[PDB]
Nucleic acid binder design. Sequence first.
RNA 1: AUGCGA
Lengths: 83, 172, 105, 59, 230, 47, 201, 608, 57
Amino acid sequence: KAIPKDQRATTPYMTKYERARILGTRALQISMNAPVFVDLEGETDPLRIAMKELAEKKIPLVIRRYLPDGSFEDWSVEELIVD
Amino acid sequence: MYKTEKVDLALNRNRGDPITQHFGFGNDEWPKEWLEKLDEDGLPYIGTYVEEGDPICAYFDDTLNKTKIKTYHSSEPAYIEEVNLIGDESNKFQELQTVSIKYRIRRTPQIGDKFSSRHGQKGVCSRKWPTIDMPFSETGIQPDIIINPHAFPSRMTIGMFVESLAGKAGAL
Amino acid sequence: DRLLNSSDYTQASVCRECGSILTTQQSVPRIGSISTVCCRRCSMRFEDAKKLLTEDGEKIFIDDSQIWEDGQGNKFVGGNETTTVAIPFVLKYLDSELSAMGIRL
Amino acid sequence: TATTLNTPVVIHATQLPQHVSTDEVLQFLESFIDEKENTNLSSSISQLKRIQRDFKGLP
Amino acid sequence: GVHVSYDNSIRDADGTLVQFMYGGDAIDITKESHMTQFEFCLDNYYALLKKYNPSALIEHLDVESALKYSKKTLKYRKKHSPHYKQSVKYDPVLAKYNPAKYLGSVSENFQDKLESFLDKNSKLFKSSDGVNEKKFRALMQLKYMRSLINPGEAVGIIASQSVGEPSTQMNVTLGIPRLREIVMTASAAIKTPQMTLPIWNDVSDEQADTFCKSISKVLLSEVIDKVIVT
Amino acid sequence: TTCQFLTKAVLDNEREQLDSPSARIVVGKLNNVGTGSFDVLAKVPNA
Amino acid sequence: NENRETARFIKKHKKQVTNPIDEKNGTSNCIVRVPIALYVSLAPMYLENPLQGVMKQHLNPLVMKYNNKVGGVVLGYEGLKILDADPLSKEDTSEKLIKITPDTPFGFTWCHVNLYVWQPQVGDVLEGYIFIQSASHIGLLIHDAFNASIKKNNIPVDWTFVHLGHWVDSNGEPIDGKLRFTVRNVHTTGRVVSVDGTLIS
Amino acid sequence: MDISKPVGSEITSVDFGILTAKEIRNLSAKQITNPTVLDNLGHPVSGGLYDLALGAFLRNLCSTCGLDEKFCPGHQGHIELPVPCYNPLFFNQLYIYLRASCLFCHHFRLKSVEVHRYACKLRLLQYGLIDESYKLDEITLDISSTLLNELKSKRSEYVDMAIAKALSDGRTTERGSFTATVNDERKKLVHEFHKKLLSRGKCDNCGMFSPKFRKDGFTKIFETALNEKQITNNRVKGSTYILSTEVKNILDTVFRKEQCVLQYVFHSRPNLSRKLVKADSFFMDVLVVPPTRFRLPSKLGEEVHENSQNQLLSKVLTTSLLIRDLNDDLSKLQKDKVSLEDRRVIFSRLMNAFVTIQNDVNAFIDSTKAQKVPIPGVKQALEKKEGLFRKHMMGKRVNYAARSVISPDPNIETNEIGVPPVFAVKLTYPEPVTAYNIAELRQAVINGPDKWPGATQIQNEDGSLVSLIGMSVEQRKALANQLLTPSSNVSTHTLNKKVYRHIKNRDVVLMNRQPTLHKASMMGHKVRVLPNEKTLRLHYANTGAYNADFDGDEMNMHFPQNENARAEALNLANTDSQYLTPTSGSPVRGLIQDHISAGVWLTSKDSF
Amino acid sequence: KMQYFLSTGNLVSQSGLDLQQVSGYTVVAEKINFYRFISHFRMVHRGSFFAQLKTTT
RNA sequence: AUGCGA
Ligand SMILES: [Zn+2]
Ligand SMILES: [Zn+2]
Ligand SMILES: [Zn+2]
């Protein structure tokens, strides 16, 4: 199943669905005391905090894009063009 | 709005025998605050303010040796309007086990309540505009109801236009 | 979230050796023994248990009818809607079964 | 104390266990306990030290 | 079950491939509206250049491969601009490159419309502030890639609602019975079976009406005037 | 005709591969469409 | 046929090892090292101590505790290995990746570890320091860790009482300190575990 | 759902398959034999339908699990059916396969080598090798047994080649090959197969004359006589009712004699399980007993109405006990009683009683197979029309939901919804407490359940719930100074407290109208509690997407309980993501009536 | 029996009186509004059997 | 079920 990184063929961009899930899951983790790598800067909503983390790509998450075969491409936040 | 209740206790009847519930008390252990609504006969004072959860009557069943109550279940408070004692169609039943209690629930005009003219042009009241904020005529009045004009062009409720001009003439 | 997690979300017992959520039962505890999850299919009758051709020691668990079984200790818990369990309820009449697949086996 | 948040779903060995010698056992014990000193398990570690002491000769 | 695969192919939630592309472009309807309004985009060119500035992204993709296929295929296709055993020497650029990865892999219909606009505005290109069909065309290509449907879209459902919902506003069977007769039952016996016949340019209108009479069925009853049985 | 399809399934000894979104809801599974079309992992420090 | 399935019972319920008496004068090597694979949860709070997370969460509470699966009390762990969620990783990354559930911030991971477990069996010869002497048992403590008791019934009647009194050996002198016995049974159905010993076999 | 209670054993697929009476007997929590239900006007009948083995009751723990009704998941008993019933669901099946056999040889009419052709094709269709399945047709040659064995040899060789190819190419797997077209090719094949099975109007493999098979409809099959032309043809080859038992005993033997093909005949995919194909699959030697828990009487507040399962099942116990009594009659009977034809009537008890009980099991299966508005059976269960699957599975009631008459409001945002404070105090969020939200949640507790951005309840990390519904401001004050307490149990050290805060001005809520006609009718709005309201407040720009009008229209408000669903309500369902319809991309949302005419008046060049 | 029939509209007879339905013959007077109360006696029904038909003629 | 907001 491992798609070689040099061999990864998918969209360089984060989908709206990709973006949404990333921010939701990461926010929820922050809400479970995942270490914040950025200034809380007053915020109290973990979702807006995760929004800040997406703005800095500090998120340490990877998207596993599945193909109906089952092979997938694991992509970091720090590379898939957010917008 | 009036809501009527039938409190029947002859549904389980079956040979007087074990019939045992009488509106009132026996164990004393009941919260004496139930008197705050119910007379020592188990029926509320006609006029009483009641809110959901308050006891609607009080009775005593020997099997439980307890003063039990039928609770009031509603979304809003009411007042007890009538308490009616029914021994009727009965053979004896002198213990007055069936009572019909009528509640008076007030209905204030409120946002979302539907209103309609004599033209089937129904609409809810979106808000209760302060009188100062209403528009005032040079006659020194501000309307009771404001209806938007753009409602008429689809409905062709022109009977409403004439009703306005005739009711105004007929009042003047 | 709406049609499941915020409605009838239930963590239900399933037999890791049977793949069913209706053979599961709590094994009976004792003053020194707790209740343990057992799969009815995954247990041997203590009256039989290969006794004619045959123990580990700690695989006998007891039913509320105080009956000992050996095995049945291979069931786990999984999140589903409870109506799903209602399906086995009908299914056992229906004469079929779920082979509920899952993790390491 | 009943669920996953503390206990693994499943545990399986990938080889048949290996009969660590008394000396290998003792080296494991001392290295493990020593690494551990650097939480009620500490009391069991004290018991492990007693085992160590019993694996040392005398309680 | 019908959704967008990550490969831009339309597969069902089974995985069975339904279409190799959404409408063959992977374009979002909710994007298209100005994707074909070139002149408007131009009058507000600098603003969209400020939105989609490519210099951030020109490092992540190829700006030639699709453009090069566009050059050989657009040339040979303009050479072969009969449908049949036509020049196969070039599938569409969408066949050869993920249109999401090499800017320029776009429908030849869209490509054609863009170039034809750029040609019909060479005077606007002698009117433009300082944009060119390669920098402006490059920008519009970037709009096209950035207008593509995201992987995973529930496009089956989207289809179903876009056919159902407007069907509430609703010689041959029309309306809802017609839509049901096709989509819902696929009945092999239409209520109003028709066959349309193109008549040759040379076919006179009078000859054509003659043919219309000449083909229609004639029942024996249809000619009978009176029947007396004694 | 749920039961008729059931009959055809059992008689086949059928196995549901649990891909259908409807089926997936029935079994209380993250829908495979859209945001459930993919997986999310985390990069975690190894030291 | 019903004997294939009994082959399933015997071959599935077989036991791996018979830990022998060290030198046949010590105790059985019931302590063994076995490489295993466990499936544990990782909280977000251990995202900066993930191997230590696994320890504090699952591995730390398991030590000095009986495991039904291993058949004993976990004596310690060796060689933890997190199974990487991604191939072609040369097998080392200053940071790892793990699959997160599709529902919660919680992670689930594979771990590989060798366990040091005390895996005693019936027949093992053990020595203990006399803990107690009651008219139905003698309490002893193996290695200062494992409770052991030999009930009067499992002791030879040729043993002698001296009045909780004081048992006197079969030779005619009271027992003292350490005792060598054969293991009749180990009781682990209670809160912890009690090993049933015998002096008559 | 709670994030505080994860699971990591998700189900990955669902296998279907027949139960087995031996499986039921071994797993069965009890045999129920007693047609009694209650005793002493109030007690659970021993070994009856309301035995505690079927779950907990009256503080009696489930006698199979010892668990209370609020804890005991309940357990399913079983009935050892005195007589083997026909499966209604396979009654058409068992009938077909009954007519397809040979009755004097007990083989199937159709050519043994032709059968072998069927086994081959169906094996190729487990792996879905369709082109190869047709490529089998190419195998070609009074036909000797050595020659028919040569066709079986060549055909098995073809299986071996198609196998070696398919495993070499990885073009399938041990688990088979399954696709919509492959499924279709199987259903088609099974059709032609059934046509060949039906074609034999006398035996070919054995030449024997099978009887014509008749049926009553749902409880009896009879075995028709033959014609003296066919009977004497039987000489050269030298309607009566039959029991389910005889059918079972014969058809088992057929299943042994024709098992070799039937292994792939009875599976659409490779039978990894080496499952014997047993005739007992269409017959029921036993019946299970569902938990009473889901068989509980319809008691609504006080009224207890008998269960239709309890009633029909009681019919099974009565009829079965009568037949058990007939077996008592055989026992009373059968010493010898050489000439007592007095059993001829008891024999009416056997035939009539047996068909009757069997029929009654049928009726308990499907109401539409018995002989008035009868109690519904399981088939008129989750299926048919709305049912369970449609009315309680594919759509359900949900918590955290509201319904209200919608009211316009231009002063709110166009993407928000003005919620009247009854909802602001009656909708909660399961808030994990942190160092960053301690202030806000401590305050919400301070407010208590009866105040603004408040919180009704607090669930500790220990799992326990503490409701603030009736706690005094002082005690809630104490928890505010306790909201940040340390860990307490290594069992719980990883968790943090939760606060059920009221919905507030930073939460998103999913507003959905009535005409769910399209996804644009159910969007995410940013919650804005408006003071002194009682009605759901909505901006005009949205009403043409809901197709809504304040005429009296009602809307449902959903409050999602999960950060992934929140993130969706901030990113996917939001009004702005619905600027256009996907149907056409004509944007949809805009101002209306009064705002349009206002633009016309303001926008006059004459307006200064 | 006439209380039952009048309280249910469950018309049963050995001929069925030649009428297209066996329900609906009895109605709640709904004295909720003078308009509604008087309107009840000026209501006439074409019958339920034509209500079940899919056509509209 | 009927009626109902519609
Ligand atoms: Zn099992
Ligand atoms: Zn139970
Ligand atoms: Zn035959």
